[PDB]
Amino acid sequence: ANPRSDRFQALAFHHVELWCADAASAAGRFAFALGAPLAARSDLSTGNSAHASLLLRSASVAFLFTAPYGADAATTASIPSFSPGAARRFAADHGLAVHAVALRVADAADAFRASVAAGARPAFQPADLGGGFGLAEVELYGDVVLRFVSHDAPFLPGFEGVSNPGAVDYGLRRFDHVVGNVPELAPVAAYISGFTGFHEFAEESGLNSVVLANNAETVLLPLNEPVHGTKRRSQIQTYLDHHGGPGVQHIALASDDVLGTLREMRARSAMGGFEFLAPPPPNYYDGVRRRAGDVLSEEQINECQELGVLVDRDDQGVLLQIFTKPVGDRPTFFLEMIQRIGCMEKDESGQEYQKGGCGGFGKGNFSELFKSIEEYEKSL
Amino acid sequence: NPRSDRFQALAFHHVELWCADAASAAGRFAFALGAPLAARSDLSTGNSAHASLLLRSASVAFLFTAPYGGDHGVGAAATTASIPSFSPGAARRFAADHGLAVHAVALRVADAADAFRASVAAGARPAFQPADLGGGFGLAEVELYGDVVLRFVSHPDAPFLPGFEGVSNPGAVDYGLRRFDHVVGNVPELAPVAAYISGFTGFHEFAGTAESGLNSVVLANNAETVLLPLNEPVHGTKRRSQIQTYLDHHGGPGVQHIALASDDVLGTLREMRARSAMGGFEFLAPPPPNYYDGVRRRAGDVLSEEQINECQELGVLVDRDDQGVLLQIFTKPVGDRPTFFLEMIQRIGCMEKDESGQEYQKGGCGGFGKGNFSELFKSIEEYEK
Numbered sequence: 001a002n003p004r005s006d007r008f009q010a011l012a013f014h015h016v017e018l019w020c021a022d023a024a025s026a027a028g029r030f031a032f033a034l035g036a037p038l039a040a041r042s043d044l045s046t047g048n049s050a051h052a053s054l055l056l057r058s059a060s061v062a063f064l065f066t067a068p069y070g071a072d073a074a075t076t077a078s079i080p081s082f083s084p085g086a087a088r089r090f091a092a093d094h095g096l097a098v099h100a101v102a103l104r105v106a107d108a109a110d111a112f113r114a115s116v117a118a119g120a121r122p123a124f125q126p127a128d129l130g131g132g133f134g135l136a137e138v139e140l141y142g143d144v145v146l147r148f149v150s151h152d153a154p155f156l157p158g159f160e161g162v163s164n165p166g167a168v169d170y171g172l173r174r175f176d177h178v179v180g181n182v183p184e185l186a187p188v189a190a191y192i193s194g195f196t197g198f199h200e201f202a203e204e205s206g207l208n209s210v211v212l213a214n215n216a217e218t219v220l221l222p223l224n225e226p227v228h229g230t231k232r233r234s235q236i237q238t239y240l241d242h243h244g245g246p247g248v249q250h251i252a253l254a255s256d257d258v259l260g261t262l263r264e265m266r267a268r269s270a271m272g273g274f275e276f277l278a279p280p281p282p283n284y285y286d287g288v289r290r291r292a293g294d295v296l297s298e299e300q301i302n303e304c305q306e307l308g309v310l311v312d313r314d315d316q317g318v319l320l321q322i323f324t325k326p327v328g329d330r331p332t333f334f335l336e337m338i339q340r341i342g343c344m345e346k347d348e349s350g351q352e353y354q355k356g357g358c359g360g361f362g363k364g365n366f367s368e369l370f371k372s373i374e375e376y377e378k379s380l
Numbered sequence: 381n382p383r384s385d386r387f388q389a390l391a392f393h394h395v396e397l398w399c400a401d402a403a404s405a406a407g408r409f410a411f412a413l414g415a416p417l418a419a420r421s422d423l424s425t426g427n428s429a430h431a432s433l434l435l436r437s438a439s440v441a442f443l444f445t446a447p448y449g450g451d452h453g454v455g456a457a458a459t460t461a462s463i464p465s466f467s468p469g470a471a472r473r474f475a476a477d478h479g480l481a482v483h484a485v486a487l488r489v490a491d492a493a494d495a496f497r498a499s500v501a502a503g504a505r506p507a508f509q510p511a512d513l514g515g516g517f518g519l520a521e522v523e524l525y526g527d528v529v530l531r532f533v534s535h536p537d538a539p540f541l542p543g544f545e546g547v548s549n550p551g552a553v554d555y556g557l558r559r560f561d562h563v564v565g566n567v568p569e570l571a572p573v574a575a576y577i578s579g580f581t582g583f584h585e586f587a588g589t590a591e592s593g594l595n596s597v598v599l600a601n602n603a604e605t606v607l608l609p610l611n612e613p614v615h616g617t618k619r620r621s622q623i624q625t626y627l628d629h630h631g632g633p634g635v636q637h638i639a640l641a642s643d644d645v646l647g648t649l650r651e652m653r654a655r656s657a658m659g660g661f662e663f664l665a666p667p668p669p670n671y672y673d674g675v676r677r678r679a680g681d682v683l684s685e686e687q688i689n690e691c692q693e694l695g696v697l698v699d700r701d702d703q704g705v706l707l708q709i710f711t712k713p714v715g716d717r718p719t720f721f722l723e724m725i726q727r728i729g730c731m732e733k734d735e736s737g738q739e740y741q742k743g744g745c746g747g748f749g750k751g752n753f754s755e756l757f758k759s760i761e762e763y764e765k
């Protein structure tokens with residue numbers, strides 16, 4: 001029973017801005033690793049002297065990589081919410097980490113001011129990019145910012161489109177959820193739920209969890225916090241140790257055939273692509289046949305077996321998922337490849353949709369994987 | 381050749397690029413250059429000081445190194461760094477100033493302590509006093525042009541470097557890169573640094589005047605294995621020099637490009653250009669067709685019909701020395717700044733069974749493509765008709 005209490009029309013994820021020291025290398029690696037070609041650029045090739053921005057896109061998922069180069073007349077920046085000192089500061093503290101999570105908004109001025117009184121500390125007050133585009137940014141958590149942008153039409157003013165025949169598309173379709181790790185969960189969760197109006201979500205390894213979501217449950221913002229005192233310390237705390245503060249832990253990418261796409265992503269893992277986490281032991285998939293065998297026939301399960309895809313269930317669907325290694329240098333930011341199978345409905349006027357968060361987020365895999373690891377460790 | 385080297389400049393060992401994200405730069409280079417990950421030294425190896433990845437393609441060894449966010453004091457003998465010359469502050473100031481640019485050019489020497497001593501005794505500025513990394517490995521570092529370092533490495537032999545866990549990725553393919561041909565620097569002013577370098581390294585000089593170019597001089601060791609060309613801009617020369625705009629965007633002197641030798645530059649380029657769409661290395665716009673009809677009248681006696689034809693599809697430049705032909709192609713700048721770029725070449729000929737009887741290959745066989753500054757100039761004007 002979501003309240004639909006969102007204080008601004010948050011439609012969907014617009015773009016995710018990463019900040020590095022060389023936006024060509026990171027975007028270059030993410031291009032073949034994810035299978036999303038270069039779609040837009042704001043560099044010296046476009047008259048931009050302040051920063052080099054490049055955008056990979058695979059349908060609706062749009063990664064943005066922004067690095068700096070300038071002076072006073074460097075008003076040529078496409079993004080006005082950009083600072084060279086902050087960009088170099090960010091690249092030294094966290095390596096390749098997410099700086100902005102941009103959402104689509106009815107109007108840039110409203111959602112900012114709807115949050116400026118709801119408790120959001122401002123980061124970039126609204127600005128008119130010209131011709132229907134407006135940009136706004138609030139602080140969210142840590143140094144990553146929540147960005148508001150409103151509207152064929154280009155990505156942003158100052159971005160020229162990129163054409164390529166390679167058309168390297170690995171079937172990736174949409175951003176699903178953007179998870180962030182913070183020291184204490186309660187204050188930042190009340191802060192984000194307070195200034196957005198977003199609600200919680202209904203559907204130990206060492207993580208205390210909470211998931212924010214909009215009315216349509218399409219803009220998912222899960223939050224994380226560690227649990228101290230464990231013999232082996234939580235992966236959230238070691239993140240906060242190596243990230244140097246709170247940040248975006250991972251980002252989920254939704255596909256409609258994540259098996260065939262993983263076959264393409266793993267093909268590039270040997271040549272500089274995304275090396276994936278070690279596949280679960282064989283007896284883990286003996287479980288998924290008992291758990292999800294009614295939804296997944298063997299051939300669909302066996303495609304998950306070699307590729308190492310994980311399987312977790314809620315009542316209204318099953319969630320295929322697989323995690324990458326830390327894509328950057330430090331054990332910090334990584335990527336989650338998922339596909340959700342279940343919970344359809346033609347309730348929205350007859351236009352069908354899938355209720356967001358279908359299948360959960362794989363929280364049950366902490367239990368079934370650790371047990372299958374111990375069950376396999378005994379058999380050797 | 382004078383044979384006046386103060387130390388045994390055996391060969392290129394590696395080129396170290398200092399960046400703020402080694403995993404991304406090494407990952408993109410491995411895909412674009414076809415050099416699989418052959419070694420790594422980071423947190424997974426016990427190295428809490430820096431993350432380092434070694435990209436390897438035969439002898440081509442690119443080393444990408446990025447610091448971690450930690451800040452250990454000067455009091456903290458018991459360090460965990462694989463490369464002891466690495467400092468966290470100089471790596472961040474290097475990434476903030478120059479972006480993605482190489483920081484060290486490593487020459488394999490007979491002995492590191494002796495290479496350092498012979499260098500500093502001839503006026504070399506010390507960068508890192510000699511050490512013994514363990515086993516038989518020895519390290520030494522002296523400056524050449526700016527923040528770039530002429531690192532000395534000494535294994536008389538074992539991995540790439542001690543503390544580096546070798547990586548063997550099954551299915552890892554290779555395009556055909558074999559050798560570092562030359563590492564070129566772009567220096568404020570040529571005469572001082574060329575006299576400075578040649579002084580402490582004992583290198584000698586090495587040898588079509590063009591209008592849209594620069595000034596240059598190439599240094600080389602005894603066997604001409606390692607080539608250290610140096611560039612200087614021309615001022616008051618109308619169009620913006622492609623060397624000064626480097627110094628303006630790079631923030632001082634640095635390494636302009638690196639030539640990578642190949643047995644089959646054609647087959648290697650055909651695989652590299654297949655990656656340019658998916659985040660690979662974008663190459664310069666191909667020369668107009670008048671160029672490749674002109675290379676037939678200049679190098680038709682030395683290249684087959686099919687060989688000249690395939691240089692045209694892949695956009696490879698052709699130049700001729702009296703001794704051999706040089707097929708070369710250049711990438712668009714690999715970083716965000718039009719700074720560091722890469723050069724893919726193959727040299728043809730210039731081999732003799734000197735001394736023992738091995739085939740050998742004369743260094744600089746074909747030159748460095750000096751005749752293409754002029755040849756490409758006319759081809760644009762002829763095409764702009």
Ligand SMILES: Cc1ccccc1-n1c(=O)c2c(C)c(C(=O)C3=C(O)CCCC3=O)ccc2n(C)c1=O
Nearest residue numbers: 179205207209222235277323336361362363365366
């Ligand atoms: C624990 C661990 C160590 C080394 C590498 C990987 C892991 N690791 C995960 O990171 C992991 C994650 C990150 C999720 C996950 O996506 C998730 C959400 O999206 C938000 C709610 C909290 C949460 O955990 C689910 C299962 C996971 N599992 C099962 C796992 O093993």
Ligand SMILES: Cc1ccccc1-n1c(=O)c2c(C)c(C(=O)C3=C(O)CCCC3=O)ccc2n(C)c1=O
Nearest residue numbers: 564596609611622637664710723748749750752753
């Ligand atoms: C200058 C320039 C601007 C925009 C795109 C392309 C170019 N460009 C080059 O960069 C270029 C280079 C860099 C070399 C080259 O490698 C070389 C050496 O390695 C050592 C001595 C200096 C030198 O010329 C040769 C020919 C070149 N040619 C023909 C060319 O057009």
Ligand SMILES: [Co+2]
Nearest residue numbers: 177252336361
């Ligand atoms: Co998730």
Ligand SMILES: [Co+2]
Nearest residue numbers: 562639723748
């Ligand atoms: Co060259």
